[PDB]
Amino acid sequence: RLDIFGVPIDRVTMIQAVDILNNFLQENRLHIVATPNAEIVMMAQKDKEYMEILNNTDLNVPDGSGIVFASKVFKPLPERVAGFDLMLEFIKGISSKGVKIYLLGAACQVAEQARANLEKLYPGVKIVGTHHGYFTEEEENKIIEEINNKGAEVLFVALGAPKQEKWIYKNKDKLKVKIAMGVGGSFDVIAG
Amino acid sequence: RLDIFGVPIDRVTMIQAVDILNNFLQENRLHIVATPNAEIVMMAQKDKEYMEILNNTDLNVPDGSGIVFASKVFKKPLPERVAGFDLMLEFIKGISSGVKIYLLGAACQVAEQARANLEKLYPGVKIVGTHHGYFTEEEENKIIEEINNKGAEVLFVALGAPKQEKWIYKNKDKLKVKIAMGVGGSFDVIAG
Amino acid sequence: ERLDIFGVPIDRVTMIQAVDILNNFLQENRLHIVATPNAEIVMMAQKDKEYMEILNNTDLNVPDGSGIVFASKVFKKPLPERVAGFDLMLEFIKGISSKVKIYLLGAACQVAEQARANLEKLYPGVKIVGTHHGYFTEEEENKIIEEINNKGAEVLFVALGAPKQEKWIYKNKDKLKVKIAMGVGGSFDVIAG
Ligand SMILES: O=c1ccn([C@@H]2O[C@H](COP(=O)(O)OP(=O)(O)O)[C@@H](O)[C@H]2O)c(=O)[nH]1
Ligand SMILES: O=c1ccn([C@@H]2O[C@H](COP(=O)(O)OP(=O)(O)O)[C@@H](O)[C@H]2O)c(=O)[nH]1
Ligand SMILES: O=c1ccn([C@@H]2O[C@H](COP(=O)(O)OP(=O)(O)O)[C@@H](O)[C@H]2O)c(=O)[nH]1
């Protein structure tokens, strides 16, 4: 772990991050995964709540070449671990074992379209549920109950930074998933 | 107002920016709203025309953590990150309960999938018209006639920076709307 | 006439100049690799030796992104303007649309196809001979390359994202029979919508 401007970044490779995520699936508790970049670290400077959340996440992966370039001053970061690429690699691995995934986030139809694209890419992928990221506080509890009841183990949150990390942290004791990871615009790129 | 590398940035919070926009609706003249970030501020360095436009806009909101981090050097730094996408949604949220909105910009059907989405999110929202942002100089005057005749008060321009600010500025005396704001890729994220 | 911005060579060209360069590339019977470096790309090249080697071997590196253009202000001869990759791609197509077989490779399912339908409506006369998504397998790779070659494509726009797009073009540089091969990032997604 190297603390880049208050935000702790885990000194892991793409392979190492993927292995950490699989190991997290063996523990029956929620693990918060975040992919900090230059924008995220800058957001943490002004936002004390956001920085507190980052300092409490299970894995902070070095998304973005900015952080990796800055780390060259320090034992620097081994490689750029992209959040989109990590999500796809982690999903690729876990489709063969049938781990229940839930997609929460983005505009209407984006999550169902990404689910369709991921099924075509990774045959045997178990995406147990989807919901858009434009829900209200009243709708929030019904989405949480849906995830919990559907038996979801991996939850990908595409609400954008800091919204995704803040949502996961606020509901950390309400969610019964093994991994909860902020993915941002990831659902938009795969759905098109 | 902070002078970040020649570009004036308004020292406002999310709430303050929304209230400013609501008050702009009470003045019978066009108000140009821009959401500068590090990419925009850097564009202004080499583009004198663009920097002149940004020094002539009614409200420059600090979108992007870069500007907000840079402001930490000043005696009076910026209070928070006021994201352009988040501002556009919060403003629409308030005025939905019947201010006439027009969506101009993005590829074919994006502005229309955006409109349909905003109508589902904010019931009662009056989006009086939409047009794609890939129009010709001939088509330009028919769009401007459409906005003016349809009685639009708020105009969201999704042409990208600096294209959106330059389009608004060039047509500042041809448009009969109270607010004209550059929203870049806000239309694609809400449409999905 | 080239600026070494942190190991990555950037061509000191304007929007017009870049377009003319591309039009002249069409007169040479060999593949030309076009890349649009920005601060993210430039930074990716620092840790990725393979990627920096590719960027030092491309035919045209256009100044996409204000960061590079701002950094260049330090040099005796700075960069004249930003040459945005999306804007370059559209201006180039605009021209060649009246005359040139284009192939769109990249992005999610139906994105390249919707980008083709939109470019056909924007630039009437545009000859887009084929499209394919960018989530293909190594087995599917050769059928796409055969499709591009057999359909007689001259211009190939690769929307795979940096560094994936430049690495794909470079790895297949001697397998592709096109005159121009350019990394266009998320350009297909903005035009398709
Ligand atoms: O209340 C919101 C606001 C946005 N979004 C989604 O969040 C993503 C924002 O992507 P962005 O690139 O801005 O985030 P980043 O990669 O910086 O974290 C998009 O898919 C939006 O549709 C959402 O689901 N809920
Ligand atoms: O001639 C143009 C060029 C662009 N756009 C739209 O403007 C946005 C381009 O912005 P981008 O995603 O590149 O990011 P930004 O520069 O705003 O940060 C997209 O909605 C495009 O479809 C448009 O309507 N007309
Ligand atoms: O293996 C992959 C991964 C991504 N993409 C596409 O590559 C683009 C990535 O866009 P991005 O904005 O991340 O790239 P940049 O502008 O930084 O080069 C999107 O259209 C994705 O759908 C693809 O075709 N193949």
Residue numbers in the entry:
A (entry chain A): 3 to 76, 78 to 195
B (entry chain C): 3 to 99, 101 to 195
C (entry chain B): 2 to 100, 102 to 195
Give the published text.
To define the enzyme active site, we determined the structure of the SeMet-labeled TagAΔC:UDP complex at 3.1 Å resolution. The crystal structure visualizes the enzyme-product complex, as steady-state kinetics studies of B. subtilis TagA have shown that the enzyme operates via an ordered Bi-Bi mechanism in which UDP-ManNAc binds first and UDP is released last. The complex crystallizes as a dimer of trimers in the P21 space group, with six molecules in each asymmetric unit. The coordinates of the apo- and UDP-bound forms of TagAΔC are nearly identical (RMSD of 0.18 Å), suggesting that the enzyme binds UDP through a lock-and-key mechanism. In each protomer, UDP contacts the β7-H8 motif within the Rossmann-like fold, as well as the C-terminal edge of strand β5. The uracil base is engaged in pi stacking with Tyr137 (β6-H7 loop), while Asp191 (H9) contacts the ribose sugar. However, the C2 hydroxyl group in each UDP molecule forms a hydrogen bond with the backbone carbonyl of Val192 (H9) located in the adjacent subunit, which may explain why the complex crystallized as a trimer. The trimeric oligomer observed in the structure of the complex is presumably an artifact of crystallization, as AUC experiments using the native TagAΔC performed in the presence of saturating amounts of UDP indicate that similar to apo-TagAΔC, the UDP-bound protein fits best to a monomer-dimer equilibrium model rather than monomer-trimer or dimer-trimer equilibrium models (Kd = 3.5 ± 0.4 μM in the presence of 10:1 UDP:TagA). Interestingly, in the crystal structure of the TagAΔC:UDP complex, the β-phosphate group of UDP extends inward toward the pocket. As UDP is a competitive inhibitor of the UDP-ManNAc substrate, it is likely that these ligands bind to the same site on the enzyme, such that the ManNAc moiety within UDP-ManNAc is projected into the pocket where it can interact with the conserved side chains of residues Thr37, Gln167 or Glu168.
The TagA N-acetylmannosamine transferase catalyzes the first committed step in WTA biosynthesis. The TagA glycosyltransferase (GT) then appends ManNAc from a UDP-ManNAc donor, producing a C55-PP-GlcNAc-ManNAc disaccharide-lipid product (lipid-β). To gain insight into the mechanism of catalysis, we determined the 2.0 Å crystal structure of the TagA enzyme from Thermoanaerobacter italicus (TagAΔC, residues Met1-Gly195). TagAΔC contains the highly conserved amino acid region that defines the WecB/TagA/CpsF family, but lacks 49 C-terminal residues that target the protein to the membrane (see below).
